[PDB]
Design a protein around this nucleic acid. Structure first.
Lengths: 48, 48, 104
RNA sequence: UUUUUAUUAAAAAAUGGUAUGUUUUUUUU
């Protein structure tokens, strides 16, 4: 939700830990932190 | 335009651009929430 | 719902959401000189090839002089005597490197 | 190293609180 815009319901509630695993993919161990990924990026380039 | 089709009297919103744009700054909380809720209704109308 | 902060929807909780900023967050030389010696001997070799080019120019001058004498192709001035003067220059540069080592 | 912004709601009926069931004809010969 962009802080000036509307807020809705999730439309996708399937985020339970059914996999029960972190997949060793998004872990801090192997990621370079330079700048936080704000939601403006996730809305501007949704597929990346 | 200079040419049109004579929409109905209730099909002219006259203030839609007020909340389609951003909210003016330094407004009380209720006015900001009103802007947001009207924008939410418009977005929900446009989505379906 | 924004930068990872907030709950998905205010419905179901006793609150209205409305996250606020913390407002109290604390935002805080070279050891093996043999390389230089090898470079020095290599620049000596470059000077050697430079003087060989000069010798070739002298050979062209000799060819022109011989052609002028004939009037009154390409030839070589010195086939091997240049190697003796080259050995003389070798002696000269060896004396130079000895003097440089003595100076240090 | 300088600044922020984010604001769910909301009232009416029946359950639920003076049950309910009864109750007056014009001819005989």
């Amino acid at each position: 939700a962009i802080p000036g815009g509307p807020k809705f319901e999730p439309l996708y509630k399937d985020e339970a830990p059914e996999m029960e695993d972190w997949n060793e993919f998004n872990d801090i161990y192997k990621l370079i932190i330079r700048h936080p990924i704000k939601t403006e990026y996730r809305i501007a380039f949704p597929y990346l | 335009k200079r040419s049109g089709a004579t929409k109905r009297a209730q099909d002219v919103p006259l203030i839609k651009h007020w909340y389609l744009e951003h909210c003016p700054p330094n407004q009380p909380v209720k006015v900001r929430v009103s802007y947001q809720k009207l924008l939410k209704s418009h977005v929900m109308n446009k989505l379906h | 719902s924004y930068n990872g902060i907030g709950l998905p929807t205010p419905r179901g909780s006793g609150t209205n959401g409305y996250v606020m900023r913390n407002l109290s967050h604390v935002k805080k030389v070279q050891d093996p000189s043999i390389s230089e010696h090898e470079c020095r001997r290599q620049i000596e070799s470059k000077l050697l090839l430079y003087r060989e080019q000069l010798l070739e120019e002298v050979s062209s001058q000799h060819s022109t002089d011989a052609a002028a004498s004939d009037s009154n192709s390409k030839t070589k001035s010195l086939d091997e005597a240049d190697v003796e003067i080259l050995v003389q220059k070798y002696r000269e540069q060896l004396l130079k490197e000895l003097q440089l080592q003595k100076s240090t």
